[PDB]
Amino acid sequence: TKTLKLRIVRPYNSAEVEKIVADEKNNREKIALEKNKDKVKEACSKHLKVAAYCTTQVERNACLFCKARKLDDKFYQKLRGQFPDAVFWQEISEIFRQLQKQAAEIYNQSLIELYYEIFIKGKGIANASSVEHYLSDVCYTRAAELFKNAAIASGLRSKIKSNFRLKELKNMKSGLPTTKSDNFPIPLVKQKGGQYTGFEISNHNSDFIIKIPFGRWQVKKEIDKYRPWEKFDFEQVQKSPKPISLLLSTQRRKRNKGWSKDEGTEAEIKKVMNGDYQTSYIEVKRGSKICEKSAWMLNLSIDVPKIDKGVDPSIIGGIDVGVKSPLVCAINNAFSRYSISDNDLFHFNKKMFARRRILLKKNRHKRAGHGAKNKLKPITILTEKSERFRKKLIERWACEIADFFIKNKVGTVQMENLESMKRKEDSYFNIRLRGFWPYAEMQNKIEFKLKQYGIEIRKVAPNNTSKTCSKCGHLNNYFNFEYRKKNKFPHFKCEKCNFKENADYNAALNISNPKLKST
Amino acid sequence: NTITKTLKLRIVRPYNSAEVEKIVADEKNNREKIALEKNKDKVKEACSKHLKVAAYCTTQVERNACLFCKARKLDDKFYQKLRGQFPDAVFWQEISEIFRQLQKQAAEIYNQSLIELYYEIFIKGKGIANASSVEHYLSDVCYTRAAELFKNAAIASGLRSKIKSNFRLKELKNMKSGLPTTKSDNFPIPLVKQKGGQYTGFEISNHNSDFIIKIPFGRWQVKKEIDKYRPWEKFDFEQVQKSPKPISLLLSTQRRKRNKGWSKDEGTEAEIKKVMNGDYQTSYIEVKRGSKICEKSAWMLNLSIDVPKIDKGVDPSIIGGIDVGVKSPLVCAINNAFSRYSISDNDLFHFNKKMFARRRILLKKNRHKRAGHGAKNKLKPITILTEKSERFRKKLIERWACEIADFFIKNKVGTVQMENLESMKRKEDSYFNIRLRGFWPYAEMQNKIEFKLKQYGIEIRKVAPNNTSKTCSKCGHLNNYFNFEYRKKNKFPHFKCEKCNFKENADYNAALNISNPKLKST
RNA sequence: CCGCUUCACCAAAAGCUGUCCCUUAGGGGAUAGAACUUGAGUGAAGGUGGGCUGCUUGCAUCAGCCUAAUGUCGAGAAGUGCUUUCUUCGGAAAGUAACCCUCGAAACAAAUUCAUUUAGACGAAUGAAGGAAUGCAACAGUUG
Ligand SMILES: [Zn+2]
Ligand SMILES: [Zn+2]
Ligand SMILES: [Zn+2]
Ligand SMILES: [Zn+2]
């Protein structure tokens, strides 16, 4: 099962109507061009670099040109009068808010009525069959006769059946969590197996076209003063449907910043469109980020069974020591990296050193009579307990690396060899931690943890890492470690590739290189 | 006309009687005399409170290296003797399990009454319910249920007043918010008794320079069924009028007497002093638990009080304004007398940055840090440091608010003008929102500054907030060039007018706009 | 050690200027200048550099105490997941114990009990009942 977040700029009614939209958008754009001959000098971005005569590019957010490209609902209303089946952005966003508040009201009121029905009249003793009877006989009919698409009512039946828990609240340990109606989409479920193909998603220019079936939604004569939204009907699909199709824009915003694309999900959407990857859920709500809380995205939810893979020796991992981290892990194929935390061990050594230097100043003439026997008594118990802490921390690190590789499904990791490891000046060790460390138990515990998950070890031990780039083995021999402390450990810039890289990840990439062999 | 407040104080012990308390006070005096003549000057640590009355020694100590005060401490076998001697007397363990049962039952009845009233308003009533219907259904359901379980009327009227002050009807009418429901066991019992004119409330008695409150209560009895599923439901709570047993508590004040402000008229010690002196009749009594300290939680107590407003020289002809700054957190601006206030002395954030580094290194990889023992323990260090940092933040905010109020009383402004909240979250010239991503809650800050200016009768006017960082203040010349990235790339300079050459602090302009009275409110 | 503080000295990847291109939505790359700044750089000094209790809280100091504590564990089985059995729509029951599964566990000091090798000290406890600093600054709170 998965949840996949895509965006929408506009509906897609037909071909020629959105053609007319683009054409008259460009027509107002060229009217803004030919009118602004030093009437404004903001030089909207794009508009200046394409064909214009303006002075200064301003940041493309408060300039006059895109407001002209921002179309008007007078023109949209005249378009609606030529073509009544050409619906637009405000119409679909009103329908979004209307269905969202509809489902939120029906959901919350049916929850509280179920809770009351079970626990105060019937005294808390019934079955879940009565819950399903309330579902089918009350809220299925309510959502199917408030809007005549019964599949949405079945999806709400599924949603409330998941969201209402009888046996939890039987002990009254908590309460029913209610929303502020900004956290609530609409189900729009179809069948999983075969017959209901699912939302008829097609391809477009690096983007998609959805098809969501509906009815007629006659705009009512009485637009209610108390109720600012409910004026539609959403008539029967079995009598007279009219499926709304929308343009699914693939722009994923990165935390209120510009337009970006993430491509770990586009292949999954293509797998939906070929015929496999049988999704059944289109959640329609706002985004959870800044300024996407007003623009309506879409959420495709999918289900796949647990198809296990295991590990394979084609994937070849690497484990290297770090300078900010005590260790790092790297895979030669994908990005797929992993740091190891430092701060807990750092604060622990800080407290241990502070305790030691406290005890080494309030003892020097204070505990008399014994000599340095009972002066040395409390530091030893500290050191056994510190050693047990270091052992448990190393076991936690080994289990973390094992979980990392098992999620990444790596068959074998090439781990850098031990005597070569300890004789390294670039490590996090031998800089602050001088030499006081049990390296061999760490290696043996890592190997035992990995072989518990069944992953072999290689001992490849190259001649010179930490300055050879993974893209091209230039052997950038100006990376002296003295130079690195002289530049306070800067990035690794492979100058022949113009390859600026986090300075230790490439060192971990050299250990994952399978072309060099073991020892 | 009046401003509400609460006072949080700690319960020391259940004050029992006059005779039994005379017995225990004389027993403390007896132990003091016994260890007075037991020590034939094997001691030189007579504490300061003892050198005046019994001094055969050398020096003074810090009132914890004493022995006579240590002799005043009472054991627990003598309390078992007092348990056997007086079965009518009350003691901590019984009162604590009473209050735990009361917290559990009050939370359950509060949840059941909230969903009951939501049902009888919106489901069966089809949403057809004005506010008078809601009060009618409050009195119809919640008071009847609470008097059906608790034979007290005080707890019943308290639950009705608490649910009335919690069921915010208009937001759940137009679907604007979420239905409340509690989760925590730290749920305070409301305890309302009225106070208007021919009634007083709870009988505050200053017996011997201390504080004794008197909660009316019935004669509880021991249960018979003790089910294994729910342990704490183990009492009966019989009727006040058939069998009154007033639980009377003692609240600590010895720490408050040693403050700088105790012989004054404005610090909260003077409100406690007037509560001792008859007036400031309380009405609303919360019984919380404090920090979990040493296997036995110290139950706090909250005392409502309707203080009259301090006059303190108010004349709303004078007008001042405040902002959010970039060098100071808050800057205050006087319209005409050219007076400015700022606060630019604290080292608070390396502290909150070490905790946030610790939270992030716990949070982002929680998978093996402390697993196998629930999620209440898995976030246990985080909860202690978040509560302590929010307490530090609230106390710094209240110190800021008192400095602001002292400034405005020093410059005699009768009414202050403050920004709209919907703009304050979206105001990126702030000293906040650039150092801090999602940390600070500003609604509580504004509530504290609103209350602290209300404490001198200075009113707070919501204003038109639009583009205040660039509109000038000496003359309204509308210098709309002073953009955000323009401000960053000029190294955060002075704002200067295009034609006044008004080179002054930009945030000080951003409040001297609001300090000019010509802005209409909203 | 210190990604602790102060002082002094020192280096510039990160920030600015300026240049140039590419879409210029997000911004991406390099070359010369300065130190506001930075530094997990150097030297002198001191300093829990984590907490707990001290009677509502915070900072600083002080008295005593805990710390492997960002740790490690105790008990369970309300819930999540998983196995088996049934109606086979949909859930139940038995477990299992992996779980952002549930409840918990360190911290002033008098005094008391029981026990320990020989009145000293340790252990297990006991557990509220004004036994507790100084100085500044405040001190409506819950719920949503
Ligand atoms: Zn523009
Ligand atoms: Zn390379
Ligand atoms: Zn004394
Ligand atoms: Zn101006």
mmCIF file of C-alpha atoms (C1' of nucleotides) in Angstrom, chain A residues 45-46 49 57 60 132 161 167-168 173 257-259 306 324 342-344 346-348 350-351 353-355 357-358 361 385-386 388-389 392 428 432 434 486-488 490, chain C residues 1-4 11-14 23-27 29-30 38-41 46-50 67-73 78-82 90-93 144:
data_model
loop_
_atom_site.group_PDB
_atom_site.id
_atom_site.type_symbol
_atom_site.label_atom_id
_atom_site.label_comp_id
_atom_site.label_asym_id
_atom_site.label_seq_id
_atom_site.Cartn_x
_atom_site.Cartn_y
_atom_site.Cartn_z
ATOM 1 C CA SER A 45 10.381 37.154 -15.827
ATOM 2 C CA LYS A 46 9.932 35.053 -18.992
ATOM 3 C CA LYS A 49 13.823 37.127 -21.615
ATOM 4 C CA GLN A 57 13.732 41.879 -13.871
ATOM 5 C CA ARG A 60 8.022 37.572 -10.757
ATOM 6 C CA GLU A 132 -22.321 -2.217 9.779
ATOM 7 C CA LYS A 161 -15.561 1.615 9.581
ATOM 8 C CA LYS A 167 -13.332 -2.270 21.419
ATOM 9 C CA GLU A 168 -10.889 0.589 22.080
ATOM 10 C CA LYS A 173 -9.570 5.177 27.354
ATOM 11 C CA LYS A 257 9.588 27.096 -2.825
ATOM 12 C CA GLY A 258 9.432 26.833 -6.603
ATOM 13 C CA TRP A 259 8.381 24.129 -9.029
ATOM 14 C CA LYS A 306 3.433 -8.052 0.467
ATOM 15 C CA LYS A 324 31.704 14.209 11.555
ATOM 16 C CA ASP A 342 27.268 11.548 16.832
ATOM 17 C CA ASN A 343 25.546 13.784 19.365
ATOM 18 C CA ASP A 344 24.564 11.168 21.971
ATOM 19 C CA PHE A 346 29.488 13.322 22.196
ATOM 20 C CA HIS A 347 27.276 14.439 25.089
ATOM 21 C CA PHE A 348 28.058 11.214 26.969
ATOM 22 C CA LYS A 350 31.243 15.379 27.646
ATOM 23 C CA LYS A 351 29.508 14.264 30.847
ATOM 24 C CA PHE A 353 35.036 14.041 31.063
ATOM 25 C CA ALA A 354 33.238 16.627 33.213
ATOM 26 C CA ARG A 355 32.705 14.050 35.979
ATOM 27 C CA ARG A 357 37.759 16.502 35.914
ATOM 28 C CA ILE A 358 35.382 17.223 38.804
ATOM 29 C CA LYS A 361 40.206 18.476 41.544
ATOM 30 C CA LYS A 385 29.833 1.529 32.982
ATOM 31 C CA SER A 386 31.171 3.649 30.093
ATOM 32 C CA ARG A 388 28.987 -1.194 28.783
ATOM 33 C CA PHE A 389 27.430 1.956 27.302
ATOM 34 C CA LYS A 392 25.315 -1.181 23.768
ATOM 35 C CA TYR A 428 36.465 10.721 13.570
ATOM 36 C CA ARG A 432 39.075 13.770 19.499
ATOM 37 C CA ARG A 434 42.689 9.617 20.710
ATOM 38 C CA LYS A 486 43.743 24.347 7.103
ATOM 39 C CA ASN A 487 40.397 24.769 5.297
ATOM 40 C CA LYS A 488 38.324 23.406 8.239
ATOM 41 C CA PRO A 490 35.673 21.717 3.167
ATOM 42 C "C1'" C C 1 38.216 16.317 25.029
ATOM 43 C "C1'" C C 2 34.787 20.428 25.501
ATOM 44 C "C1'" G C 3 30.615 21.506 18.563
ATOM 45 C "C1'" C C 4 31.623 25.650 27.566
ATOM 46 C "C1'" A C 11 42.717 30.698 8.428
ATOM 47 C "C1'" A C 12 38.494 31.602 4.976
ATOM 48 C "C1'" A C 13 34.935 26.522 2.423
ATOM 49 C "C1'" A C 14 29.990 29.693 4.287
ATOM 50 C "C1'" U C 23 15.303 28.195 -17.561
ATOM 51 C "C1'" U C 24 16.711 32.542 -14.896
ATOM 52 C "C1'" A C 25 9.912 29.524 -10.936
ATOM 53 C "C1'" G C 26 14.005 27.185 -6.896
ATOM 54 C "C1'" G C 27 18.018 29.260 -7.478
ATOM 55 C "C1'" G C 29 28.980 27.305 -10.931
ATOM 56 C "C1'" A C 30 33.857 30.162 -10.688
ATOM 57 C "C1'" U C 38 32.463 31.889 10.961
ATOM 58 C "C1'" G C 39 35.780 28.082 12.996
ATOM 59 C "C1'" A C 40 34.609 20.394 15.479
ATOM 60 C "C1'" G C 41 41.567 26.601 14.829
ATOM 61 C "C1'" G C 46 38.329 29.219 35.383
ATOM 62 C "C1'" G C 47 33.963 26.120 34.549
ATOM 63 C "C1'" U C 48 28.707 19.523 34.894
ATOM 64 C "C1'" G C 49 29.644 21.058 29.907
ATOM 65 C "C1'" G C 50 23.400 16.879 32.225
ATOM 66 C "C1'" U C 67 23.804 9.640 36.369
ATOM 67 C "C1'" A C 68 25.882 4.026 31.224
ATOM 68 C "C1'" A C 69 20.142 8.447 32.163
ATOM 69 C "C1'" U C 70 19.751 11.050 24.707
ATOM 70 C "C1'" G C 71 20.934 5.043 29.067
ATOM 71 C "C1'" U C 72 19.158 0.388 30.671
ATOM 72 C "C1'" C C 73 15.100 -2.309 32.444
ATOM 73 C "C1'" A C 78 -6.553 -2.152 25.839
ATOM 74 C "C1'" G C 79 -4.848 -1.442 20.730
ATOM 75 C "C1'" U C 80 -1.396 -2.155 15.736
ATOM 76 C "C1'" G C 81 0.927 -6.073 13.005
ATOM 77 C "C1'" C C 82 1.726 -11.618 12.431
ATOM 78 C "C1'" G C 90 -17.300 -9.359 7.215
ATOM 79 C "C1'" G C 91 -15.321 -10.019 11.917
ATOM 80 C "C1'" A C 92 -14.541 -12.958 16.333
ATOM 81 C "C1'" A C 93 -11.539 -16.111 19.624
ATOM 82 C "C1'" G C 144 -9.802 23.335 22.315
#
